[PDB]
Amino acid sequence: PAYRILKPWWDVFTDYISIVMLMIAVFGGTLQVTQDKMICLPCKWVTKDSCNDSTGPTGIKYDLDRHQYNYVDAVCYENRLHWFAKYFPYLVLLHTLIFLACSNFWFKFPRTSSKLEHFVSILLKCFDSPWTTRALSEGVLDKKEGEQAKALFEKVKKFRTHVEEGDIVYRLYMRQTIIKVIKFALIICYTVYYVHNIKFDVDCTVDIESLTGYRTYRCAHPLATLFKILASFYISLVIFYGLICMYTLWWMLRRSLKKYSFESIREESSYSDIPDVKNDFAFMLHLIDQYDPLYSKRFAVFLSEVSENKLRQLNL
Amino acid sequence: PAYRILKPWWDVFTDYISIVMLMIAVFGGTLQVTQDKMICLPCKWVTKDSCNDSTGPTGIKYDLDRHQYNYVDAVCYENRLHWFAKYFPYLVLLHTLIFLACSNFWFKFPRTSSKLEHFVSILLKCFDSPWTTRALSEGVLDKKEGEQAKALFEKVKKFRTHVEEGDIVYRLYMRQTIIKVIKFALIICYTVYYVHNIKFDVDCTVDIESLTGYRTYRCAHPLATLFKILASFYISLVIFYGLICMYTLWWMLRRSLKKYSFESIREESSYSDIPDVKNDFAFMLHLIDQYDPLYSKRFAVFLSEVSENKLRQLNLNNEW
Amino acid sequence: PAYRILKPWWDVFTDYISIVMLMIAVFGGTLQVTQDKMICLPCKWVTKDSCNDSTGPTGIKYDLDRHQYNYVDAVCYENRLHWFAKYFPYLVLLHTLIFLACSNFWFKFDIVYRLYMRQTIIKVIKFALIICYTVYYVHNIKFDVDCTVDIESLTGYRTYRCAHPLATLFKILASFYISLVIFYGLICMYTLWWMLR
Amino acid sequence: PAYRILKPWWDVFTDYISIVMLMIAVFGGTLQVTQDKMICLPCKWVTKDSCNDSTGPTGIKYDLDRHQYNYVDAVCYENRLHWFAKYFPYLVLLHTLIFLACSNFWFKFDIVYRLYMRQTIIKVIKFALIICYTVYYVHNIKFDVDCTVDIESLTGYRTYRCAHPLATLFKILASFYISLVIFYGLICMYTLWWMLR
Amino acid sequence: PAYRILKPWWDVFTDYISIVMLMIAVFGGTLQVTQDKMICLPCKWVTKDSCNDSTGPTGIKYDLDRHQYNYVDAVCYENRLHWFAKYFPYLVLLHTLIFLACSNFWFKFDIVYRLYMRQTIIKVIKFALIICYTVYYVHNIKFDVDCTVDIESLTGYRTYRCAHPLATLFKILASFYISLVIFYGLICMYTLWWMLR
Amino acid sequence: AFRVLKPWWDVFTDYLSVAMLMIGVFGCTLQVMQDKIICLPKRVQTVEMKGLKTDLDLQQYSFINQMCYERALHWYAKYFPYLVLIHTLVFMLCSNFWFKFDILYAMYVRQTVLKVIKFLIIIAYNSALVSKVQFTVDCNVDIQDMTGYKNFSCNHTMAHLFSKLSFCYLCFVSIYGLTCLYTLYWLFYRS
């Protein structure tokens, strides 16, 4: 849909980070689905609901069947294992889905999507028109090419009139980035202060004494360390994502995006009456600047009435 | 395709919510197919078919084989596990499929499909027409572009006559929205009332003493709280869907969508002859205004007859 | 392609119902391939090849290995489980494949009118056969199946009481499958009604 | 592409038959790679390498561990199961692939007409060999399998009576396969006569 | 796209080697999720954390439940196995992703010449570091692991002689990786000379 | 389209290499299965027969399984699909070597000669080492200290399948080498 020119480097980096967070979430989720088991063994010596831990050695017989063990595993995996250690992959699924929705909201919101595709289409049309090249290099003009040149001038004028009035795209991108930064802050706060609860050895005390005979059990969690690693790795990526997001907000407070200055482009060129555009038109011009200012240079000559005068006398 | 112009923001929102709902359904379905089980342990001491819940401690011996234990898990998984905890993902898949079929119901229904493709085709090709630029600019008219503009004028008049008679698309969209909102209400009701039955601990009494020796067993359903939170998550999605649909229904009852007015466009433009379209014409024009007013502004000229007279004058000067 | 003008509303809904029935078919086939089995416990008390069904409770010692249990499950799946309860997803696969072959035969082949009329008659009578033949046998899918295979010389018992885990879910498939077939026939009814009017 | 004018109805029908044969081969290979096994219990009371087949009932203790049982199952799966019952999916896969290569021979290879003539002779003679070898060996698959591998030095018994759970499936698969091949061959046979006349 | 003809032969060679080493990493990850365990058998003669080893043969009774065995194996795997043997596939997966991202970073962003400078330098330096760290730790992918955790309060033993099953194959997989990277490194040095030409 | 300069031998080799890759994927799927070897001790301690009590746990049995997989089963018998996959990757890499490269004649005969020698080496090695894929295996690992038995007899579950796959693989490489030798004969028969 040729929207790639409208997503700057920060948007592409955040989308890649969200894709790899989706990968992390999928891997952690399938591991938690398939092989997230807890191996619980009772402790014989109880010291006030605490485990005492005290020629040829002989194995310790608990007289427990293979289902009694599976029941105590389920009970101490549910009741006593901390909820983050169980539902971290689902948390990162929800968070990366919300991040992707925030990123592509203004792409999929028709009120701003229509304006965006309008702006993209006319930029692409002005990219290939040759009056742009004649004006920037500043004559022969074929009837057809002069016709679409004047038509494109008229679309530029009407579309500047249509877009310059409102600031819905600018305010929506404001809302998008502030929501992303506040949710990144919440994600880091809760994840940082909850991550340490992933532990390989867990001592559960669930009182299934009527069903197994033991009160306190010591359980291994073979997928804890891996989760820990993934958690750490996931946290690191959010750091990267978080940093990138702040850049965008910093950029969006670096200067007022609701106004644009054509001083450099019209100063280096002959056409000195190119007007300084505002609002949504200025904002998507800023994004195209962050992609390539050559697009802004190529488009800037259709905004002047002096170039209209030159085109009229050349066409005459 | 180019049907995205007919889908406002609420339709896109519901489509994405339905995609996520289908993902939930598939995840729960493979969970129930592969890992869903029960770990059922007999109660050694019982009191009237109820678990009494009664020198280092030692284990309790049940003298049950692995095959007897499998039988106990199977029987207490069918007979005493709540059916919601078992067939929640299949219910979610059914609800998602019905929602998706309702969303694309007017798309594939031929009587509305023909109107929709005709409207989309002539709207897009009217947008592509340079006569809109030449007219809202206000002769500048080639023989060929004047000919295709006359053909498009004829096509627009023909389609207006063809589609003004029936308002079937508006009624179909009304029916889809009302069906979606009532299905949201039903889903929220039964899911809220039944989500409390997904619990980890289940006391089963299946009366297989002749085969195992124990009357009552205590079972742990491992995928219970998960099947709770997913369901809770699912409920949240439905709420969003419903709210979205609610707004859509409100949007289709605040003003009459079968009476369109070109007052703003025909006031800001020089043409004051553009009439007010009705019925399905008005409904699809309102749906397009939910996309942008620009498409309606560039098609209002082709809907006008004074612009047709001006074009006819231009072609008359072109030929003569 | 451009043949959508030759596919009316009934054709579109029948095609969508056919795809949905194909999903049900492949789901049932995957379940049969992966998780279809039985759990069979011997009956301690017997009375002429029938389970007699006759302080703290204790477990019954069947005195059998795990592999003799596996042999009992295999033999009571081969002998005393009904063939339809074992082959229902495959029969539904065959019905859906032949149904797609009948519905889309004229696309891949007054010749066209003859094929269309033959396909309509075939699909109506085939809906009737499918609904009758599936409603008739749907009671053979039971949770509990008592098996009696005479493997005493290899196991030590004559009677067992198997349980089929994926049975009732198949029921939840089968009725729903039948329901889809019902809807198909309903559409067919309207088509025939339209073919009368 | 636009080769449907160069592909007549018999080539398309044989291609569809080959597709069905391919998915039958895939299903058989999947079943054999995941769920294929045998379940062997020794014959406790034997009379000259033959199973004699003879207060409540107690399970027979063979005193074989689950691993000894696995050893017996594998050893009897090789040395006594008929080779067709084990290699049917691979045989049908090879036959389907060679049929595909033969049917799609001119599409990447009056010399074209003579090439099709030789291709039809090769395909029909392979059909003849296929139908002969398949028909002769369909009835060489049985559920209950005798086994006399003489492994008394490792488990303590000589003769075993195993169960082959998906064996019947293969027969049924083979059964359907026969029909496909016959159809394919019959269709191809017509083509030969269609070019002979 | 528009970058097909710019790449020389060595770039295509690097791309092919990257794809091979990509699916090597992926297949290793599948093996790690599937069959990554290790089986510990407790030592019957333990004298201060040391396995002494000082008619028909008979087995040894350890009197451990299968679940105590599971606890022993899990603890000896997450406490007495080197991070390299446990996380070989996730680390090589990270190396694949970083290598591919650095190979294609200039697409996503003489600034282009300086970018491709930095990417080639990063590629060659990471080749060097990967070779160093891999050959420095390749010895720890070995079968026999004498684990000693002292969970005798739960098992009654203190040392176990485990043997990692998917290790030697992992070893040869690792071997394959380094050999591939070696050719990659060779090609990389060529690129270095070109971009130092 | 180079199909004009692609005679029958090149297309035949392409389809054969696709078949090689399919065979290698199937063999890798066979090696994916956890149950690989099954080991029981030897000389373990109308006539009614009784089962011999090996006095072994499940984990002891698994330990002997992996040990006899280590030290008794042949390396080719354990990574035959692995070699097959690597060698078909080599086949598809060097099959288009003349296309992806009197220099034209030179690199074409170079491609044909390299393909021929790879075929001949594969034939020699496969014919030499194919006999090592046996079902009944005798294993003499020294795990008497942990299990109690010093000699074992094992069965490799899919050894027959690997032998059949190797027979099909040898037939495929045989057709490959026959058509490539015909290519070499056509190339060097005339200038």
Ligand SMILES: CCCCCCCC/C=C\CCCCCCCC(=O)OC[C@H](COP(=O)(O)OCCN)OC(=O)CCCCCCC/C=C/CCCCCCCC
């Ligand atoms: C948060 C949700 C996000 C998405 C997650 C979707 C959930 C997917 C649901 C299940 C997926 C696979 C279904 C498997 C069912 C069959 C189970 C089965 O046969 O038994 C489990 C079986 C045996 O396990 P245990 O006996 O514990 O192992 C021995 C202990 N040492 O476990 C397995 O290893 C399963 C087989 C592995 C394949 C499943 C996928 C695992 C993830 C693969 C990682 C690498 C994939 C790379 C992707 C390639 C993409 C190009």
